[PDB]
Paper text:
In our structure, the two [name] dimers contact the dynein-A motors via their WD40 domains. They bind at two sites: one at the interface between AAA3-AAA4 (Sitering) and the other at the base of the stalk (Sitestalk). The [name]-bound dynein-A motors have a bent linker docked onto their AAA2/AAA3 domains, indicating they are in a pre-powerstroke state (low microtubule affinity). In dynein-A motors we find the nucleotide density in both the AAA1 and AAA3 pockets is consistent with ADP. The nucleotide state of dynein-A is surprising since the presence of ADP in AAA1 typically corresponds to a high microtubule affinity state, whereas dynein-A motors are detached from the microtubule in our structure. This implies [name] overrides the dynein conformation dictated by the bound nucleotides, stabilizing the pre-powerstroke state. A striking feature of our structure is that the [name] bound dynein-A motors are in a pre-powerstroke conformation with their stalks raised up and detached from the microtubule.
Cytoplasmic dynein is a microtubule motor vital for cellular organization and division.
Residue numbers in the entry:
A (entry chain A): 2566 to 3195
B (entry chain A): 3534 to 3824
C (entry chain C), D (entry chain B): 89 to 297, 307 to 410
The structure:
Amino acid sequence: DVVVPTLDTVRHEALLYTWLAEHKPLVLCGPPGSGKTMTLFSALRALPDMEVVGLNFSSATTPELLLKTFDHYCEYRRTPNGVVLAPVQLGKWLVLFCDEINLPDMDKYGTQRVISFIRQMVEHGGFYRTSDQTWVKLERIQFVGACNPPTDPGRKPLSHRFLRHVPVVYVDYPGPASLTQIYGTFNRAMLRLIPSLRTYAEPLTAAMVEFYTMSQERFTQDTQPHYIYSPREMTRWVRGIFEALRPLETLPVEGLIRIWAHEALRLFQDRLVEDEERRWTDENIDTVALKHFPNIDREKAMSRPILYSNWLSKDYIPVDQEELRDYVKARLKVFYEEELDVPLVLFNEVLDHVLRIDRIFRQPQGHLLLIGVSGAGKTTLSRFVAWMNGLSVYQIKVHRKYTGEDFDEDLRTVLRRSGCKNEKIAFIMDESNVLDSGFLERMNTLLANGEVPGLFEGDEYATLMTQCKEGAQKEGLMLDSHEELYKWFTSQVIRNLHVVFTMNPSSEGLKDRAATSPALFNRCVLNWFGDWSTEALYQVGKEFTSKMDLEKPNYIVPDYMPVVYDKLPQPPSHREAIVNSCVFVHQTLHQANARLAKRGGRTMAITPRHYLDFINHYANLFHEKRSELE
Amino acid sequence: HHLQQANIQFRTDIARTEYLSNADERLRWQASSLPADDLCTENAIMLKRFNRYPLIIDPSGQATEFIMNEYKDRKITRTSFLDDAFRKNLESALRFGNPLLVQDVESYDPVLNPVLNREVRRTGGRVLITLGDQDIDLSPSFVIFLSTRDPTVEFPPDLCSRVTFVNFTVTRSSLQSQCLNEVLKAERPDVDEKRSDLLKLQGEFQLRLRQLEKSLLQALNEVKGRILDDDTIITTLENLKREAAEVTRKVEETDIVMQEVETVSQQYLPLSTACSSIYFTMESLKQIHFL
Amino acid sequence: RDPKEWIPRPPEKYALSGHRSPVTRVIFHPVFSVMVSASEDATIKVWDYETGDFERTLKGHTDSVQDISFDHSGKLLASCSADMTIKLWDFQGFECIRTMHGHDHNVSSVAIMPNGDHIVSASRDKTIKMWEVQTGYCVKTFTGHREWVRMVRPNQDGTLIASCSNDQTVRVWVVATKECKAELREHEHVVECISWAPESSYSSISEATPGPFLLSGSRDKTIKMWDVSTGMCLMTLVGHDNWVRGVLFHSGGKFILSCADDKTLRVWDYKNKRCMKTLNAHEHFVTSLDFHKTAPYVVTGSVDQTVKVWECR
Amino acid sequence: RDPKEWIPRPPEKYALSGHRSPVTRVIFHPVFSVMVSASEDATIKVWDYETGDFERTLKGHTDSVQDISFDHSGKLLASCSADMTIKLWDFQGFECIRTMHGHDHNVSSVAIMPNGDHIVSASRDKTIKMWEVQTGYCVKTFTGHREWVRMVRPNQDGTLIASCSNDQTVRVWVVATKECKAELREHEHVVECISWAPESSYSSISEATPGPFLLSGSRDKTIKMWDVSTGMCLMTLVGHDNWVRGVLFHSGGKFILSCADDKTLRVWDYKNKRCMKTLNAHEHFVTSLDFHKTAPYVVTGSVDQTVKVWECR
Ligand SMILES: Nc1ncnc2c1ncn2[C@@H]1O[C@H](COP(=O)(O)OP(=O)(O)O)[C@@H](O)[C@H]1O
Ligand SMILES: Nc1ncnc2c1ncn2[C@@H]1O[C@H](COP(=O)(O)OP(=O)(O)O)[C@@H](O)[C@H]1O
């Protein structure tokens, strides 16, 4: 809710107060994350007569969502001149904020059902209840909207007959010369616990400018569909830096640059796909912190692993890879006896990934979106992190004939376990667990708002109020009625429920997911795990194949030397040469899959589970044939 | 080529099928209706030495009979995915410690995901796995096999990660041998039956010679004294003489086998070449008009 | 010196070794100068802490022995392991008297109230069982926890027991009335160790803020004080860098002896809201500790298969 | 009672059986309560000597093993056999780590000096070889022996390596300087076994007839003792009626327990220079003996396919 006023902010504030004082509709178009719901929520806080109902549209949006919203937040009343729809808060004005107006799908014959429905209730002031085909007139209902421009890939333009009744105001990104004091006042707030670093505070905000401009220079949306950058990332930057130096109370300039670079690498490198842009972002970090912070210890402030953990000590301190790795081995030894007896191997990327997962899991409303091939250990690492943070893990247990009712009952049990008994729940479900469009629609609503309209109905609604009032009386709060009890339940669900969605990367699947679901790309933090690189394959090969006997003291290093793992140490041993050979085996079948596909043959998915099948079959064959020969 | 270029020596004059499979296990596989070609022998090695539970694509149906005749003493229950009593059969297979063969994996059920991923809870010495909603005591003598009839099936990567694929395709050598066998059955039946009997005889005499070598090695490994002073080693000598007589007898069977196979080769080898060419045209003709 | 001012000091008086597995629980014999430890290699190793050597071995279990316990006399011992067994041993002749069965899952901890006629047990099946030492039959069954019960511990007179569990709650039950008297849910993580207050500490906690009082160490790197009659968190001590594994009151009623997964033993003064002393204990996680009720001795058993004995000063 | 006076008593505490061959060498674990035996059937067996339970069998050598040696951590095990190979075993992993080649005959001994970095190897080819443990390469070579080098042992500080051979010599060398510091020629027959003197015996030897000192037992039914610095036989035990196969000091530094081929396990004190107790251990030739540093147990490995453990009292 902290909004520092700028020129465009107060101009659009006056505009929105004008559009909204007359109970007239308005559409805040513009690039995503430019503050269009910041300006709207600033306009709503000026007038206390107005109450907000949040709705998030998808590609598969229907007016039945608005019907459920009217069932929850409004009532049908009988009047002599017709049937009227009025909010349950008498005297207040309900306004419905739909987040994704451009997003519902344009049909084969040039129409949108929700857009024509909203135009019907705006031009004529009412709708048709289809239960008995009766004209319901809206009494105190207005609409506001937000949308991306129609020239975006996932967005479609609106009809002229709809914009004949609605004005559109186009916000933009604030630009560098506004963001510099927007985050300058934030850093002047945040550098008050440490009274010595504030002379570096104003360039640091300025530093947070320039990287972002190259973040708008190269990483366009034509490269990857999830390459969007908004001032939400700078808000994430300042709250990560604030939660870093909140309990520490002692840090030099080098530690401040280290924390800044670590937050930048956790905010600008996880969304990248290839390692080329990861190298480019690390190079940009190096040159930006060299340009804005001269005469400082570059070796002390900047190192390779840059990891920040709170597992070993209660403060957010920088720690080395080896002590963290040993603690992860000991915690796996503990963890194998409690939840799952599935063995886990490590490398440097495993430690980096579990630190990313823990960093997003620690905050309330922490939602994860993992991108990676199947068998890459996506759900096992999340299970380990969720166990270590004391979070119960829930899987939906999908079987054949999974309709929407079983999913609704599963979400009912999840929300009742999370928000009513105040138990921390890590809700895990895969991309193969999605079977209907209603699954993704209810997941989008739960990810965005933290509540589902129409999920609880009938006797289970009153059961939810009894359970919520029992949980509130156990907690200590004296609650009553239904609306504020549902508000407390929604706050508890926001605080306690962490949702992790994992898919596989795709050229068309991620492009379609970026349009059919905003909340996975607007409310979830994306971690691109990807396939296992050659460095990871060499580390798992060299770490499992050290127990057995492989060494030839007389080994001739060949002059041809086929190297596929970079930084192979020369002179290599026999074990290094054959681990590089195993990496070559995996790489040449990666090439062979494309060779088979380009001929016309159907290919099959190569996974790191196959590589862990191949390296496990090495030691079983070696121990058998050595004991056979002896 | 990568192993040669990286100066890592390997057994060059060793067949990939022969290094993994024993002779008696190969004879048991030949007894279990498997064709004698190298590809089906390789697939039998894959089914023998699995680590992930295998998915068997088979456009002809021979692998199902091979698996049934392989685990015949261990009672395989044959079920399918679209069978109504499929989860109860899987629960009974997990409780009893029975091998299980499941057909039609193109209609795959996600409910077999924790069994295929081996996500197993350890209740002390007891082993418990949560299948569906029920915790079942997993006996360690359980295997599963995921059959497929159609060859042109695409699979999701979530199922593709957890299984080891085994494809029973049709080679030119196996097809040529089967067509030669049916041509010999149709044309020269006495030569065909005596060739089959002599092949069985050569196999069992090779088994007897391997039994000689193993028994003599384990006999001389534990004499624990003077061989000359012990008269039981003279009975070992008599055993050596008898099996040397049988390995001298084996050469005449080899000569008659050689004459029979050269006669039927010069009789019907271009016929089997035409068989291979026509069936490979059959398999390649789907590239034209999809139907 | 006096029993009031015993404080452990570095370095250790003894460093005993010999276990094949991580040591899980170490305690003292009350009458004789005997110390006893157990580990995950299904054995119970009996040592002499005064002389610092090996005395005896007890091999009856099949799986990881989680927790062992004494009685008021010290002639009787109860141990629990992962094979769903409870083995009741003696001490005067060193044989296994009984083998109680009935638990569904890993029996995590056992204890005997000072009347000695009955044995409590906690397990992973979300139950607490209450067995007769004369019959080997689970007579009573406390039920109501939501998850795995970490360890259970009874009070000084055998009227109240407390259990810390994996539901992140600490539940204090009454033995006679079979009902959870206090449900304390303020800890965020799993509560791994609890302790009762002695008589001489009864005033001193009232100086820091009658009773009954209870210590509780959890995986949220904090040590909390509770009053059962009130039900609120009396104080919270922070300073442990990792998951707290063993929390025990000092015999003087003034210090707090605790150990965590940061390889340190910490002595706290709860009057000054701080840890007064920090000692490097082991190389790996210190699973359990115990203070000797009359002699200046502290035993620490840990993951790295060495039991360290410190002379208090 | 203290570990100082400990003399074993008949009968055996345990009679372990299951070897298919004569037993060549038996040693105790330094910290654990388990013992490892070596036998001529190329099977390196691991037995728990406290309960008499067979634990495990390591089969890596493709010929009969002669000597096995631990390290003081107890993690690495060095084993020598007649296949031109030496094998390094991870004791916690129970699998081999590396195999050493370079000897052209029967590797009759193997040992690890207390620096924890290398391996001694005496063999039939009249030479001693030094082996690098972590890398796996043969570094250094003691040369000068003219017959079968029987068995080799390094000193407790790791600076002296002493070896007995079949040419009636006891040759003490320095580790890196490659010179024979002491070529002791007083024994009448093949010296089959030596035993380095502990520190507590260094006074006890010096008042029987400072340091360092060394024992040796030969086929001439005599056990001689030598001062390394001077280079002469100070004292000699006679009273065995056959070949002395293994000679061993007490851990406290007073007694010498020695096994000989006349079915005798005799304890000798250099204060009286006689045999006080003679034990008829097995029914055949007794090859090796071992006595624990802290535990009152003597293990004895003999040709009769049984390994006998005797309680010291
Ligand atoms: N002047 C400003 N003061 C405070 N915060 C700002 C300012 N400008 C931008 N922001 C931040 O930019 C972010 C835009 O996010 P939001 O408005 O939620 O995106 P959307 O409107 O697309 O939902 C907000 O979270 C807000 O914190
Ligand atoms: N780093 C790893 N070390 C060991 N095993 C792994 C690792 N990554 C994946 N696995 C194996 O993969 C299986 C589970 O894969 P999963 O995590 O479900 O992949 P995804 O989450 O991408 O579907 C487990 O049985 C596990 O043995």
